[PDB]
Amino acid sequence: VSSAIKTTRLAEAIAGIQLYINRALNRIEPNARADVSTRQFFTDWTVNN
Amino acid sequence: RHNLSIDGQPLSLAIYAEPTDPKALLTSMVQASQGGSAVLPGTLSLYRF
Numbered sequence: 351v352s353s354a355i356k357t358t359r360l361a362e363a364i365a366g367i368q369l370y371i372n373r374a375l376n377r378i379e380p381n382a383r384a385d386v387s388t389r390q391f392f393t394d395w396t397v398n399n
Numbered sequence: 400r401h402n403l404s405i406d407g408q409p410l411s412l413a414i415y416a417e418p419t420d421p422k423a424l425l426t427s428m429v430q431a432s433q434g435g436s437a438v439l440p441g442t443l444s445l446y447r448f
Contacts, residue, residue: 351400352400352401352402354401354402354410354411355400355402
């Protein structure tokens with residue numbers, strides 16, 4: 351990204367973890383725990399994302 | 400990444416630091432050292448003063 355765009359530490363942490371969750375749930379990174387990925391939080395990912 | 404909109408319009412107004420005005424130029428008279436004439440010994444006239 352360019353130096354012009356700004357953010358906050360908490361906002362950037364949220365963006366990073368959101369990206370990680372999407373990659374894990376969509377089988378993009380191997381060895382993802384299939385038991386953990388069925389938690390109620392991840393089932394409702396359509397509104398928790 | 401480059402701080403543009405979906406259409407490509409920039410989102411930050413730029414600056415250029417306006418050029419520094421016209422310039423004043425002046426001329427001046429110049430003088431130099433000048434000498435004078437000399438005096439020679441005088442002739443003796445044939446006539447009275």
